[PDB]
Amino acid sequence: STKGRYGLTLMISLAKKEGQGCISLKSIAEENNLSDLYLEQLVGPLRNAGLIRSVRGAKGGYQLRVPAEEISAGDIIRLLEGPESIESEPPAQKQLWIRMRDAVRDVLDNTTLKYLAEYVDT
Amino acid sequence: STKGRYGLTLMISLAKKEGQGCISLKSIAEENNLSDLYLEQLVGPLRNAGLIRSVRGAKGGYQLRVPAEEISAGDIIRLLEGPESIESEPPAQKQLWIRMRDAVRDVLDNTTLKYLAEYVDT
C-alpha cells in the first residue's frame, strides 16, 4: 500500500523528533517527493486516530500525540490501508497463504515506531 | 503471482497422486478453471526443472518426477515467478520490508509439497 508506506515514513520522521516541537507538512512532503495534498490524505486518518496532532501556529506543522513506543508499524498500516480468493484453490493452499499473511502481520505488529526511529545504520 | 499460485495447485494435485500413474493436463485445467494453453506455460518450467514429467501415451498426462517430500512451496513459486524500492524511504523502513519478505520466504521454504498434500480438512 503506497499510502501505508508513505504514512509510515511520515510517522518515523515525527518519531525522530518526539518532544522537540514540530515538523511542517511542507518539509515532510518535500523530503519524500510527495505533493502536500497527497500528504494531507495520510495526515487526516492519523490525526483522527489520535496518533499525531497539529500545532496551532505552524500553518500545517505536526508532532506525535502518542509516544512512539506505543505505536506499531502494523497500527499505522492498518489505519491507512486496511485491517484475493480463488475458489478452485485447495484448502491446504488457502491455509498456506493465511500462514504467510500471519507471518507478515507478526513482523508488523511487533515492530514499534520507536524501534524504527532508533535503528542504527552507516 | 498468478502463475505461482496455479503452479502450486498443479503440483498439489500431482502430489496427491504420487506413484499412481498420471493426471491429464486436460483434467487439471478443467478442475482449476484455466485454459490448457495457460497450464502449458506452467508445465514447461516445472518439467525443465525436473520436478514433473509427461507419460508417453497420455497425449498430455503428467506425474511428479521427484517425490513430494523433496519439494517446497518456495521452490515452486521461485521457478514460476522469480527467485519496489522508493529512494526516499528511511533505512529502518527498507529493513522492515526485508524482514517481512524474509518471514514469507521462511513459511514458503519450510512448507513441503508432501505437507500440502496431506493437510486434513472437513
Coordinates of N, CA and C in Angstrom, one line a residue:
Chain A
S1 N 0.8 -1.2 0.0 CA 0.0 0.0 0.0 C 0.9 1.3 0.0
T2 N 0.8 2.0 -1.1 CA 1.5 3.3 -1.2 C 1.3 4.2 -0.1
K3 N 0.0 4.4 0.3 CA -0.4 5.2 1.4 C 0.2 4.7 2.7
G4 N 0.2 3.4 2.9 CA 0.8 2.8 4.1 C 2.3 3.1 4.2
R5 N 3.0 2.9 3.1 CA 4.4 3.1 3.1 C 4.7 4.6 3.5
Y6 N 4.1 5.5 2.8 CA 4.4 6.9 3.0 C 3.9 7.4 4.4
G7 N 2.8 6.8 4.8 CA 2.3 7.1 6.2 C 3.3 6.7 7.2
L8 N 3.9 5.5 7.0 CA 5.0 5.0 7.9 C 6.2 5.9 7.9
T9 N 6.6 6.4 6.7 CA 7.7 7.3 6.6 C 7.4 8.6 7.4
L10 N 6.2 9.2 7.2 CA 5.8 10.4 8.0 C 6.0 10.1 9.5
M11 N 5.5 9.0 9.9 CA 5.5 8.7 11.4 C 6.9 8.5 11.9
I12 N 7.8 7.9 11.1 CA 9.2 7.8 11.6 C 9.8 9.1 11.7
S13 N 9.6 10.0 10.8 CA 10.1 11.4 10.8 C 9.6 12.1 12.1
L14 N 8.3 12.0 12.4 CA 7.8 12.6 13.6 C 8.4 12.0 14.9
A15 N 8.6 10.6 14.8 CA 9.1 9.9 15.9 C 10.5 10.3 16.2
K16 N 11.3 10.7 15.2 CA 12.7 11.1 15.3 C 12.8 12.5 16.0
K17 N 11.6 13.1 16.2 CA 11.6 14.4 16.7 C 10.7 14.5 18.0
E18 N 10.2 13.3 18.5 CA 9.2 13.3 19.6 C 9.7 14.3 20.7
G19 N 8.8 15.2 21.1 CA 9.1 16.1 22.2 C 10.0 17.3 21.8
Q20 N 10.2 17.5 20.5 CA 11.1 18.6 20.1 C 10.4 19.6 19.2
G21 N 9.1 19.8 19.4 CA 8.3 20.7 18.6 C 7.7 20.0 17.4
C22 N 7.8 20.7 16.3 CA 7.0 20.2 15.1 C 7.8 20.1 13.8
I23 N 7.2 19.4 12.9 CA 7.7 19.3 11.5 C 6.6 19.8 10.6
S24 N 7.0 20.7 9.7 CA 6.0 21.2 8.7 C 5.6 20.1 7.7
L25 N 4.3 20.1 7.3 CA 3.9 19.2 6.3 C 4.7 19.5 5.1
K26 N 4.9 20.7 4.8 CA 5.7 21.1 3.6 C 7.1 20.4 3.6
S27 N 7.8 20.4 4.7 CA 9.1 19.8 4.8 C 9.1 18.3 4.6
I28 N 8.1 17.6 5.2 CA 7.9 16.2 5.0 C 7.6 15.8 3.6
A29 N 6.7 16.5 3.0 CA 6.4 16.3 1.6 C 7.6 16.4 0.7
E30 N 8.3 17.5 0.9 CA 9.5 17.8 0.1 C 10.5 16.7 0.3
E31 N 10.7 16.3 1.6 CA 11.7 15.3 2.0 C 11.4 14.0 1.3
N32 N 10.2 13.7 1.0 CA 9.8 12.4 0.5 C 9.2 12.4 -0.9
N33 N 9.3 13.5 -1.6 CA 8.9 13.6 -3.0 C 7.4 13.3 -3.2
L34 N 6.6 13.9 -2.3 CA 5.1 13.7 -2.4 C 4.5 15.1 -2.5
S35 N 3.4 15.3 -3.1 CA 2.6 16.5 -3.0 C 2.1 16.8 -1.6
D36 N 2.0 18.0 -1.2 CA 1.4 18.3 0.1 C 0.0 17.8 0.2
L37 N -0.7 17.8 -1.0 CA -2.1 17.4 -1.0 C -2.2 15.9 -0.7
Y38 N -1.2 15.1 -1.3 CA -1.2 13.7 -1.0 C -0.9 13.4 0.4
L39 N 0.0 14.2 1.0 CA 0.4 14.0 2.4 C -0.8 14.3 3.3
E40 N -1.6 15.3 2.9 CA -2.8 15.6 3.6 C -3.7 14.4 3.8
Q41 N -3.8 13.6 2.8 CA -4.7 12.4 2.8 C -4.2 11.4 3.8
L42 N -2.9 11.4 4.1 CA -2.3 10.5 5.1 C -2.5 11.1 6.5
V43 N -2.3 12.4 6.6 CA -2.4 13.0 7.9 C -3.8 12.9 8.5
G44 N -4.8 13.1 7.6 CA -6.2 13.0 8.0 C -6.5 11.9 9.0
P45 N -6.3 10.6 8.5 CA -6.6 9.4 9.3 C -5.7 9.3 10.5
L46 N -4.4 9.6 10.4 CA -3.5 9.6 11.6 C -3.9 10.5 12.7
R47 N -4.4 11.7 12.3 CA -4.9 12.7 13.2 C -6.2 12.2 13.9
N48 N -7.1 11.6 13.0 CA -8.4 11.1 13.5 C -8.2 10.0 14.5
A49 N -7.2 9.2 14.3 CA -6.9 8.1 15.2 C -6.2 8.5 16.5
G50 N -5.8 9.8 16.5 CA -5.2 10.4 17.7 C -3.7 10.2 17.8
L51 N -3.0 9.7 16.7 CA -1.6 9.4 16.8 C -0.7 10.6 16.6
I52 N -1.2 11.6 15.8 CA -0.5 12.8 15.6 C -1.4 14.0 15.8
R53 N -0.8 15.2 16.0 CA -1.7 16.4 16.1 C -0.9 17.6 15.5
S54 N -1.7 18.6 15.1 CA -1.1 19.8 14.5 C -0.9 20.8 15.6
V55 N 0.1 21.7 15.4 CA 0.4 22.8 16.4 C -0.3 24.0 15.9
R56 N -0.8 24.9 16.8 CA -1.7 25.9 16.4 C -1.2 27.0 15.4
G57 N 0.2 27.2 15.4 CA 0.7 28.3 14.6 C 1.4 27.9 13.3
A58 N 1.8 26.7 13.1 CA 2.7 26.3 12.0 C 2.0 26.2 10.7
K59 N 0.8 26.6 10.5 CA 0.1 26.5 9.3 C 0.3 25.2 8.6
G60 N 0.2 24.1 9.4 CA 0.5 22.8 8.9 C 1.8 22.2 9.4
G61 N 1.9 22.2 10.7 CA 3.0 21.7 11.4 C 2.6 20.6 12.4
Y62 N 3.3 19.5 12.5 CA 2.8 18.3 13.2 C 3.8 17.7 14.2
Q63 N 3.2 16.9 15.1 CA 4.0 16.2 16.1 C 3.3 14.9 16.5
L64 N 4.0 14.0 17.0 CA 3.4 12.8 17.6 C 2.5 13.3 18.8
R65 N 1.3 12.7 18.9 CA 0.5 12.9 20.0 C 0.6 11.8 21.1
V66 N 1.0 10.6 20.6 CA 1.2 9.4 21.4 C 2.6 9.0 21.2
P67 N 3.3 8.6 22.3 CA 4.7 8.2 22.2 C 5.0 7.1 21.3
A68 N 6.1 7.2 20.6 CA 6.5 6.2 19.6 C 6.5 4.8 20.1
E69 N 6.8 4.6 21.3 CA 6.9 3.2 21.9 C 5.5 2.6 22.0
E70 N 4.5 3.3 21.9 CA 3.1 2.8 22.0 C 2.5 2.5 20.6
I71 N 3.2 2.8 19.5 CA 2.6 2.6 18.2 C 3.4 1.6 17.4
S72 N 2.7 0.7 16.8 CA 3.4 -0.3 15.9 C 3.2 0.0 14.5
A73 N 4.2 -0.5 13.7 CA 4.1 -0.3 12.2 C 2.8 -0.9 11.7
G74 N 2.3 -2.0 12.3 CA 1.1 -2.6 11.9 C -0.1 -1.6 12.2
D75 N -0.1 -0.9 13.3 CA -1.1 0.0 13.6 C -1.2 1.1 12.5
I76 N -0.1 1.5 12.1 CA 0.0 2.6 11.1 C -0.6 2.1 9.7
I77 N -0.1 0.9 9.3 CA -0.5 0.4 8.0 C -2.0 0.2 8.1
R78 N -2.5 -0.4 9.1 CA -3.9 -0.7 9.3 C -4.8 0.5 9.1
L79 N -4.4 1.6 9.7 CA -5.2 2.9 9.6 C -5.3 3.4 8.2
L80 N -4.2 3.3 7.5 CA -4.1 3.9 6.1 C -4.6 3.0 5.0
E81 N -4.4 1.7 5.2 CA -4.6 0.7 4.1 C -5.8 -0.2 4.3
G82 N -5.9 -0.6 5.6 CA -7.0 -1.6 5.9 C -6.5 -2.6 6.9
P83 N -7.5 -3.2 7.6 CA -7.2 -4.1 8.8 C -6.5 -5.4 8.4
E84 N -6.3 -12.2 -2.7 CA -7.6 -12.4 -3.4 C -7.9 -13.9 -3.5
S85 N -9.2 -14.3 -3.2 CA -9.6 -15.6 -3.1 C -9.8 -16.2 -4.5
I86 N -9.4 -17.5 -4.7 CA -9.6 -18.2 -5.9 C -10.3 -19.5 -5.5
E87 N -11.5 -19.6 -6.0 CA -12.4 -20.7 -5.4 C -11.9 -22.1 -5.7
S88 N -11.1 -22.3 -6.7 CA -10.6 -23.6 -7.1 C -9.4 -24.1 -6.2
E89 N -8.7 -23.1 -5.5 CA -7.6 -23.4 -4.7 C -7.9 -24.4 -3.6
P90 N -7.0 -25.5 -3.5 CA -7.2 -26.5 -2.5 C -7.1 -25.8 -1.1
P91 N -7.8 -26.4 -0.1 CA -7.8 -25.9 1.3 C -6.3 -25.7 1.9
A92 N -5.4 -26.7 1.6 CA -4.1 -26.5 2.1 C -3.4 -25.3 1.5
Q93 N -3.6 -25.0 0.3 CA -3.0 -23.8 -0.3 C -3.6 -22.5 0.2
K94 N -4.9 -22.5 0.4 CA -5.6 -21.3 1.1 C -4.9 -21.1 2.5
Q95 N -4.7 -22.2 3.2 CA -4.1 -22.1 4.5 C -2.7 -21.6 4.5
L96 N -2.0 -22.0 3.5 CA -0.6 -21.6 3.3 C -0.5 -20.0 3.1
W97 N -1.4 -19.5 2.3 CA -1.5 -18.0 2.2 C -1.8 -17.3 3.5
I98 N -2.7 -18.0 4.3 CA -3.0 -17.4 5.6 C -1.8 -17.4 6.5
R99 N -1.0 -18.5 6.4 CA 0.2 -18.6 7.2 C 1.2 -17.5 6.8
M100 N 1.3 -17.2 5.5 CA 2.2 -16.2 5.0 C 1.7 -14.8 5.6
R101 N 0.4 -14.5 5.3 CA -0.2 -13.3 5.8 C 0.1 -13.1 7.3
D102 N -0.2 -14.1 8.1 CA 0.1 -14.1 9.6 C 1.6 -13.8 9.9
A103 N 2.5 -14.3 9.1 CA 3.9 -14.1 9.4 C 4.2 -12.6 9.2
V104 N 3.7 -12.0 8.1 CA 3.9 -10.6 7.8 C 3.2 -9.8 9.0
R105 N 2.0 -10.1 9.3 CA 1.3 -9.4 10.4 C 2.2 -9.4 11.7
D106 N 2.7 -10.5 12.0 CA 3.6 -10.7 13.2 C 4.8 -9.7 13.2
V107 N 5.5 -9.6 12.0 CA 6.6 -8.7 11.9 C 6.1 -7.3 12.1
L108 N 5.0 -6.9 11.5 CA 4.5 -5.5 11.6 C 4.0 -5.2 12.9
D109 N 3.3 -6.1 13.6 CA 2.7 -5.8 14.9 C 3.8 -5.8 16.0
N110 N 4.9 -6.5 15.9 CA 5.9 -6.5 16.9 C 7.0 -5.5 16.6
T111 N 6.8 -4.6 15.7 CA 7.8 -3.6 15.4 C 7.2 -2.2 15.8
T112 N 7.8 -1.6 16.8 CA 7.3 -0.3 17.3 C 7.9 0.8 16.4
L113 N 7.2 1.9 16.4 CA 7.7 3.1 15.8 C 9.0 3.6 16.5
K114 N 9.1 3.5 17.8 CA 10.3 3.8 18.5 C 11.5 3.0 18.0
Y115 N 11.2 1.7 17.8 CA 12.2 0.8 17.2 C 12.7 1.3 15.9
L116 N 11.7 1.6 15.0 CA 12.0 2.2 13.7 C 12.9 3.5 13.8
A117 N 12.6 4.3 14.7 CA 13.2 5.6 14.9 C 14.7 5.4 15.4
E118 N 15.0 4.3 16.0 CA 16.3 4.2 16.7 C 17.2 3.2 16.0
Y119 N 16.8 2.7 14.8 CA 17.6 1.8 14.0 C 18.9 2.6 13.7
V120 N 20.0 1.9 13.8 CA 21.3 2.4 13.6 C 21.9 1.9 12.3
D121 N 22.3 2.8 11.4 CA 22.9 2.4 10.1 C 24.2 3.2 9.9
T122 N 24.9 2.9 8.9 CA 26.0 3.7 8.4 C 27.3 2.9 8.1
Chain B
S1 N 1.7 -13.9 -7.4 CA 2.0 -14.3 -8.7 C 0.9 -15.4 -9.1
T2 N 0.1 -15.0 -10.1 CA -1.0 -15.9 -10.6 C -0.4 -17.2 -11.1
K3 N 0.7 -17.2 -11.9 CA 1.4 -18.4 -12.3 C 1.8 -19.2 -11.2
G4 N 2.4 -18.6 -10.1 CA 2.9 -19.3 -9.0 C 1.8 -20.0 -8.3
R5 N 0.6 -19.3 -8.0 CA -0.5 -20.0 -7.4 C -1.0 -21.2 -8.1
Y6 N -1.2 -21.0 -9.4 CA -1.8 -22.1 -10.2 C -0.7 -23.2 -10.4
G7 N 0.5 -22.9 -10.5 CA 1.6 -23.9 -10.5 C 1.6 -24.7 -9.2
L8 N 1.4 -24.1 -8.1 CA 1.3 -24.8 -6.8 C 0.2 -25.7 -6.8
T9 N -1.0 -25.2 -7.2 CA -2.2 -26.1 -7.3 C -2.0 -27.3 -8.2
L10 N -1.3 -27.1 -9.4 CA -1.0 -28.2 -10.2 C -0.2 -29.3 -9.5
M11 N 0.9 -28.8 -8.8 CA 1.8 -29.7 -8.1 C 1.1 -30.4 -6.9
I12 N 0.2 -29.8 -6.2 CA -0.5 -30.4 -5.1 C -1.4 -31.6 -5.7
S13 N -2.0 -31.3 -6.8 CA -2.8 -32.3 -7.5 C -1.9 -33.6 -7.8
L14 N -0.8 -33.3 -8.4 CA 0.1 -34.4 -8.8 C 0.7 -35.1 -7.5
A15 N 0.9 -34.3 -6.5 CA 1.4 -34.9 -5.2 C 0.4 -35.8 -4.6
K16 N -0.9 -35.5 -4.8 CA -1.9 -36.3 -4.2 C -2.1 -37.6 -5.0
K17 N -1.3 -37.8 -6.0 CA -1.4 -39.0 -6.8 C 0.0 -39.7 -7.0
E18 N 1.0 -39.1 -6.3 CA 2.4 -39.7 -6.5 C 2.4 -41.2 -6.5
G19 N 3.0 -41.7 -7.6 CA 3.1 -43.2 -7.7 C 1.9 -43.9 -8.1
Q20 N 0.9 -43.2 -8.6 CA -0.4 -43.8 -9.0 C -0.7 -43.5 -10.5
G21 N 0.3 -43.4 -11.3 CA 0.1 -43.1 -12.7 C 0.0 -41.6 -13.0
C22 N -0.9 -41.2 -13.8 CA -0.9 -39.8 -14.3 C -2.2 -39.0 -14.2
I23 N -2.1 -37.7 -14.3 CA -3.2 -36.8 -14.4 C -3.1 -36.1 -15.8
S24 N -4.2 -36.0 -16.5 CA -4.2 -35.3 -17.8 C -4.1 -33.8 -17.5
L25 N -3.4 -33.1 -18.4 CA -3.4 -31.7 -18.4 C -4.8 -31.2 -18.5
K26 N -5.6 -31.9 -19.4 CA -7.0 -31.5 -19.6 C -7.8 -31.5 -18.3
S27 N -7.6 -32.5 -17.5 CA -8.4 -32.7 -16.3 C -8.0 -31.6 -15.2
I28 N -6.7 -31.3 -15.1 CA -6.2 -30.3 -14.2 C -6.7 -28.9 -14.6
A29 N -6.6 -28.6 -15.9 CA -7.1 -27.3 -16.4 C -8.6 -27.1 -16.1
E30 N -9.3 -28.2 -16.4 CA -10.8 -28.1 -16.1 C -11.0 -28.0 -14.6
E31 N -10.3 -28.8 -13.8 CA -10.5 -28.7 -12.4 C -10.3 -27.4 -11.8
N32 N -9.4 -26.6 -12.4 CA -9.0 -25.3 -11.9 C -9.4 -24.0 -12.7
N33 N -10.3 -24.2 -13.6 CA -10.8 -23.1 -14.4 C -9.7 -22.4 -15.2
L34 N -8.8 -23.1 -15.8 CA -7.7 -22.5 -16.6 C -7.8 -23.0 -18.0
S35 N -7.3 -22.3 -19.0 CA -7.2 -22.9 -20.3 C -6.0 -23.8 -20.3
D36 N -6.1 -24.9 -21.2 CA -5.0 -25.8 -21.3 C -3.7 -25.1 -21.7
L37 N -3.9 -24.1 -22.5 CA -2.7 -23.3 -23.1 C -2.0 -22.6 -21.9
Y38 N -2.8 -22.1 -21.0 CA -2.2 -21.4 -19.9 C -1.5 -22.4 -19.0
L39 N -2.1 -23.6 -18.8 CA -1.5 -24.6 -18.0 C -0.1 -25.0 -18.6
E40 N -0.1 -25.1 -19.9 CA 1.1 -25.4 -20.6 C 2.3 -24.6 -20.3
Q41 N 2.0 -23.3 -20.0 CA 3.1 -22.3 -19.6 C 3.6 -22.6 -18.2
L42 N 2.8 -23.3 -17.4 CA 3.3 -23.6 -16.1 C 4.0 -24.9 -16.1
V43 N 3.5 -25.8 -16.9 CA 4.1 -27.1 -17.0 C 5.6 -27.0 -17.6
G44 N 5.7 -26.2 -18.6 CA 7.0 -26.0 -19.2 C 8.2 -25.9 -18.2
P45 N 8.2 -24.9 -17.4 CA 9.2 -24.6 -16.4 C 9.4 -25.7 -15.3
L46 N 8.2 -26.3 -14.9 CA 8.3 -27.4 -13.9 C 8.9 -28.7 -14.5
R47 N 8.7 -28.9 -15.8 CA 9.3 -30.0 -16.5 C 10.8 -29.8 -16.7
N48 N 11.1 -28.6 -17.1 CA 12.5 -28.2 -17.3 C 13.4 -28.3 -16.0
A49 N 12.7 -28.0 -14.9 CA 13.4 -28.1 -13.6 C 13.5 -29.5 -13.1
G50 N 12.8 -30.5 -13.8 CA 12.9 -31.9 -13.5 C 11.9 -32.3 -12.4
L51 N 10.9 -31.5 -12.0 CA 10.0 -31.8 -10.9 C 8.9 -32.6 -11.4
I52 N 8.5 -32.5 -12.6 CA 7.4 -33.3 -13.2 C 7.8 -33.9 -14.5
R53 N 7.1 -34.9 -15.0 CA 7.4 -35.5 -16.3 C 6.1 -36.0 -17.0
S54 N 6.1 -36.0 -18.3 CA 5.0 -36.5 -19.0 C 5.1 -38.0 -19.3
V55 N 4.0 -38.7 -19.4 CA 4.0 -40.1 -19.7 C 3.8 -40.2 -21.2
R56 N 4.4 -41.2 -21.8 CA 4.5 -41.3 -23.2 C 3.2 -41.4 -24.0
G57 N 2.1 -41.9 -23.4 CA 0.9 -42.2 -24.1 C -0.3 -41.2 -23.9
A58 N -0.3 -40.5 -22.8 CA -1.5 -39.8 -22.4 C -1.7 -38.5 -23.2
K59 N -1.0 -38.2 -24.2 CA -1.2 -37.0 -25.0 C -1.4 -35.8 -24.1
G60 N -0.5 -35.7 -23.1 CA -0.5 -34.6 -22.2 C -1.0 -35.1 -20.8
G61 N -0.3 -36.1 -20.3 CA -0.6 -36.6 -19.0 C 0.7 -36.5 -18.1
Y62 N 0.6 -36.2 -16.9 CA 1.7 -35.8 -16.0 C 1.8 -36.5 -14.7
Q63 N 3.0 -36.6 -14.1 CA 3.2 -37.1 -12.8 C 4.4 -36.4 -12.2
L64 N 4.5 -36.4 -10.9 CA 5.7 -36.0 -10.2 C 6.9 -36.8 -10.7
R65 N 8.0 -36.2 -10.9 CA 9.3 -36.9 -11.2 C 10.1 -37.0 -9.9
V66 N 10.0 -36.1 -9.0 CA 10.7 -36.0 -7.8 C 9.6 -36.1 -6.7
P67 N 9.9 -36.9 -5.6 CA 9.0 -37.1 -4.5 C 8.6 -35.8 -3.8
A68 N 7.3 -35.7 -3.4 CA 6.7 -34.5 -2.9 C 7.5 -34.0 -1.6
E69 N 8.0 -34.9 -0.9 CA 8.7 -34.6 0.4 C 10.0 -33.8 0.1
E70 N 10.5 -33.8 -1.2 CA 11.7 -33.2 -1.5 C 11.5 -31.8 -2.1
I71 N 10.2 -31.4 -2.3 CA 9.9 -30.1 -3.0 C 9.2 -29.2 -2.0
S72 N 9.7 -27.9 -2.0 CA 9.0 -26.9 -1.1 C 8.1 -26.0 -2.0
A73 N 7.1 -25.4 -1.3 CA 6.2 -24.4 -2.0 C 7.1 -23.3 -2.5
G74 N 8.1 -23.0 -1.8 CA 9.0 -21.9 -2.2 C 9.7 -22.3 -3.5
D75 N 10.2 -23.5 -3.6 CA 10.8 -24.0 -4.8 C 9.9 -23.8 -6.0
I76 N 8.6 -24.1 -5.8 CA 7.7 -24.0 -6.9 C 7.4 -22.6 -7.3
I77 N 7.2 -21.7 -6.3 CA 7.0 -20.3 -6.6 C 8.2 -19.7 -7.3
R78 N 9.3 -20.0 -6.8 CA 10.6 -19.4 -7.4 C 10.7 -19.8 -8.9
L79 N 10.4 -21.0 -9.3 CA 10.5 -21.5 -10.6 C 9.6 -20.7 -11.6
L80 N 8.4 -20.4 -11.1 CA 7.4 -19.8 -11.9 C 7.3 -18.3 -11.9
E81 N 7.7 -17.7 -10.8 CA 7.5 -16.3 -10.6 C 8.8 -15.5 -10.6
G82 N 9.8 -16.1 -9.9 CA 11.1 -15.4 -9.7 C 11.7 -15.7 -8.3
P83 N 13.0 -15.6 -8.2 CA 13.8 -16.0 -7.0 C 13.5 -15.1 -5.8
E84 N 8.9 -3.0 -4.4 CA 9.5 -1.9 -5.2 C 10.2 -0.9 -4.4
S85 N 11.5 -0.5 -4.8 CA 12.2 0.4 -4.0 C 11.8 1.9 -4.2
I86 N 11.7 2.6 -3.0 CA 11.4 4.0 -3.0 C 12.6 4.7 -2.4
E87 N 13.3 5.5 -3.2 CA 14.6 6.0 -2.7 C 14.5 6.9 -1.5
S88 N 13.4 7.5 -1.2 CA 13.3 8.4 0.0 C 13.0 7.6 1.3
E89 N 12.6 6.4 1.2 CA 12.3 5.6 2.4 C 13.5 5.5 3.3
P90 N 13.3 5.8 4.6 CA 14.4 5.6 5.6 C 14.9 4.2 5.7
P91 N 16.2 4.0 6.0 CA 16.8 2.7 6.1 C 16.1 1.7 7.0
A92 N 15.5 2.2 8.1 CA 14.8 1.3 9.0 C 13.6 0.7 8.3
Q93 N 12.9 1.6 7.5 CA 11.7 1.1 6.8 C 12.0 0.1 5.7
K94 N 13.1 0.4 5.0 CA 13.6 -0.6 4.0 C 13.9 -1.9 4.7
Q95 N 14.5 -1.9 5.8 CA 14.8 -3.1 6.5 C 13.6 -3.9 7.0
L96 N 12.6 -3.1 7.4 CA 11.3 -3.7 7.8 C 10.7 -4.5 6.7
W97 N 10.7 -4.0 5.5 CA 10.2 -4.7 4.3 C 11.0 -6.0 4.1
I98 N 12.3 -5.9 4.3 CA 13.1 -7.0 4.1 C 12.8 -8.1 5.2
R99 N 12.5 -7.7 6.4 CA 12.1 -8.6 7.4 C 10.8 -9.3 7.1
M100 N 9.8 -8.5 6.5 CA 8.6 -9.1 6.1 C 8.8 -10.1 5.0
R101 N 9.5 -9.7 4.0 CA 9.9 -10.6 2.9 C 10.5 -11.9 3.4
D102 N 11.4 -11.8 4.3 CA 12.1 -13.0 4.8 C 11.1 -13.9 5.6
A103 N 10.2 -13.3 6.3 CA 9.2 -14.1 7.0 C 8.3 -14.9 6.1
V104 N 7.9 -14.3 5.0 CA 7.2 -15.0 3.9 C 8.0 -16.1 3.4
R105 N 9.3 -15.8 3.0 CA 10.2 -16.8 2.4 C 10.3 -18.0 3.4
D106 N 10.5 -17.7 4.6 CA 10.5 -18.8 5.6 C 9.3 -19.7 5.6
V107 N 8.1 -19.2 5.6 CA 6.9 -20.0 5.5 C 7.0 -20.9 4.3
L108 N 7.3 -20.3 3.1 CA 7.3 -21.0 1.9 C 8.3 -22.0 1.8
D109 N 9.5 -21.7 2.3 CA 10.7 -22.7 2.2 C 10.5 -23.9 3.1
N110 N 9.8 -23.7 4.2 CA 9.7 -24.7 5.2 C 8.4 -25.5 5.1
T111 N 7.7 -25.3 3.9 CA 6.4 -26.0 3.7 C 6.7 -26.9 2.5
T112 N 6.7 -28.2 2.7 CA 6.9 -29.2 1.6 C 5.6 -29.4 0.9
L113 N 5.7 -29.9 -0.4 CA 4.6 -30.3 -1.1 C 3.9 -31.5 -0.5
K114 N 4.6 -32.4 0.1 CA 4.0 -33.5 0.8 C 3.1 -33.0 1.9
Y115 N 3.6 -32.1 2.6 CA 2.9 -31.4 3.7 C 1.6 -30.8 3.1
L116 N 1.6 -30.1 2.0 CA 0.4 -29.6 1.4 C -0.5 -30.7 1.0
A117 N 0.0 -31.8 0.5 CA -0.8 -32.9 0.0 C -1.6 -33.6 1.1
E118 N -1.0 -33.6 2.3 CA -1.6 -34.4 3.4 C -2.3 -33.6 4.5
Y119 N -2.6 -32.3 4.2 CA -3.4 -31.4 5.1 C -4.7 -32.0 5.2
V120 N -5.3 -32.1 6.4 CA -6.6 -32.7 6.6 C -7.6 -31.6 7.0
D121 N -8.7 -31.6 6.2 CA -9.7 -30.6 6.5 C -11.1 -31.4 6.6
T122 N -12.1 -30.6 6.9 CA -13.5 -31.1 6.7 C -14.4 -30.8 8.0

